């Protein structure tokens, strides 16, 4: 994990902010990722995360779902541009997702890889299926659901070891956050890879929309972000 | 005539009123026409 | 619409009635109970049959293609029905003479109907005079009974 600390000294000196949060990370007060989120700041410059999540750029926390070209007409023929769906996040607890556009497949991919650096959000975890009574973050804690477009889906815990079981453009974006074993009930139309992606990721957001009282914390081993490096 | 209103849309067909009237001219027939 | 029809405790009888009725509006249910695939099926619902040939004709394909596929007409033995057999294998038509006993299979497409460009056929050849046709497609075997 060396290079992904060398990048900190490579980057922190080679950039001046244009926003404010830029400063409040550049000058040594806030230096730990998990204390910038739950306060309603704004993320507009895509380096603040790199300076604290410097493994997001590793070509392995990065995943590229699909390229799809779209068309429109003008009175001089066709005009055509690409959209790629790209998601990223370290393989510990944090994931982000972006679309982007552009007129060439490169510019598209890079633009999207950048957009998906800002939205990035964090999770909870657990193990609370009726079998894995263990307490180690290898499954989503409690059955929750999320909606988008014309697709609903509700995730269910499951025992340590049952391999990922969801559609083929869900296995990636579940693998990134490392959620390994989880069972799937689908509705709607799973053939627009986009709304699929966005609905799954929305559910994983909603993971933090239910109140778990003090005691239940030590029933499923809920965590937040990294746990036991 | 136990209407089925998906047909009036006139898309790739002909009007409905002026098809009913022509089916009558054959039901009145196969009833009258030696259907005795 | 409201909650649901007999969503009470005791009215299960009505509920079984509701399901027993609305089950019929299907299409695979009916085509089985009433056994309609039976008694409209020039083989009486079986996986193969034998026949005799009558002619040698040719058919044209779907709208956006071009060609004249060859075709034969078999007269069945099980029923006296007269059914339409297509034969694959380039130029296989060089062999099927008038009055040769042949075998007939399906073509296994949508619903069991036809497939591809030849829309009007439903039956293809496998064996002639007890000889597997794929052979004569690449020769590789000789032919009995002339």
């Amino acid at each position: 994990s060396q290079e992904w600390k060398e990048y900190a000294k490579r980057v922190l000196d080679e950039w001046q902010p244009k926003t404010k949060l830029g400063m409040l990370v550049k000058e040594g007060q806030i230096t730990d990722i998990h204390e910038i989120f739950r306060k309603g700041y704004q993320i507009k410059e895509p380096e603040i995360i790199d300076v604290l999540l410097p493994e997001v750029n590793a070509r392995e926390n990065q995943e590229i779902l699909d390229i799809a070209l779209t068309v429109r007409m003008t009175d001089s023929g066709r005009r055509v541009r690409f959209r790629v769906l790209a998601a990223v996040g370290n393989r510990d607890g944090y994931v982000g997702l972006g679309i982007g556009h552009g007129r060439e497949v490169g510019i598209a991919i890079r633009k999207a890889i950048n957009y998906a650096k800002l939205n990035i959000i964090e999770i909870k975890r657990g193990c609370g299926s009726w079998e894995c009574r263990c307490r180690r973050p290898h499954s989503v804690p409690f059955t929750v659901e999320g909606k988008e477009g014309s697709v609903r889906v509700k995730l269910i815990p499951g025992p340590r070891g049952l391999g990922l079981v969801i559609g083929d453009v869900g296995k990636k974006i579940l693998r990134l956050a490392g959620i390994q074993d989880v069972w799937s009930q689908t509705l709607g139309e799973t053939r627009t890879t986009v709304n699929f992606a966005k609905a799954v990721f929305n559910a994983l957001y909603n993971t933090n929309k239910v109140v778990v009282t003090p005691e239940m914390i030590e029933r499923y081993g809920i965590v937040v972000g990294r746990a036991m490096p | 005539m136990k209407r089925r209103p998906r047909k009036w849309k006139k898309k790739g067909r002909m009007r409905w009123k002026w098809i009913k009237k022509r089916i009558r001219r054959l039901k009145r027939q196969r009833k009258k026409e030696r259907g005795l | 619409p409201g909650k649901k029809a007999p969503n009470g405790e005791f009215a299960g009888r009505k509920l079984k009635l509701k399901r027993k009725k609305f089950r019929w509006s299907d299409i695979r249910y009916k085509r089985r109970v009433l056994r309609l695939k039976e008694k409209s099926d020039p083989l009486e619902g079986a996986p193969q049959a034998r026949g005799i040939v009558l002619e040698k004709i040719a058919v044209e394909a779907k709208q956006p293609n071009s060609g004249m596929r060859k075709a034969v007409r078999v007269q069945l033995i099980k029923n006296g029905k007269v059914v339409t057999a297509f034969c694959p294998g380039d130029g296989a038509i060089k062999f099927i003479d008038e009055h040769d006993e042949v075998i007939i299979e399906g073509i296994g497409g949508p619903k069991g109907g036809s497939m591809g460009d030849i829309p009007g056929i439903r039956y293809k050849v496998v064996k002639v005079n007890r000889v597997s046709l794929k052979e004569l497609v690449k020769g590789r075997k000789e032919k009995p009974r002339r």
Partner: protein
Amino acid sequence: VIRVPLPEGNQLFGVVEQALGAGWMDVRCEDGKIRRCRIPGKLRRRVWIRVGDLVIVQPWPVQSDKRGDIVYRYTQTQVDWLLRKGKITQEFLTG
């Protein structure tokens, strides 16, 4: 010599009595038989056919009455030149 498409092999001359329609061509040779020819998509495309437009055709061993497959109509440049030699006789059009 000259490229006037002599009936090669077993081509037939078809002067049409009427296009029975939609590719159906009721054609006529000097045989005694009145035929029903059919047309490809190559020439249903780039050329036009009318009554009195002689074409060459071919049979299939079926029925010896109504066969025929178009591979070249004739040209007005030779439609009558082919006569001066005597390769086509003109009592199969004119009563």
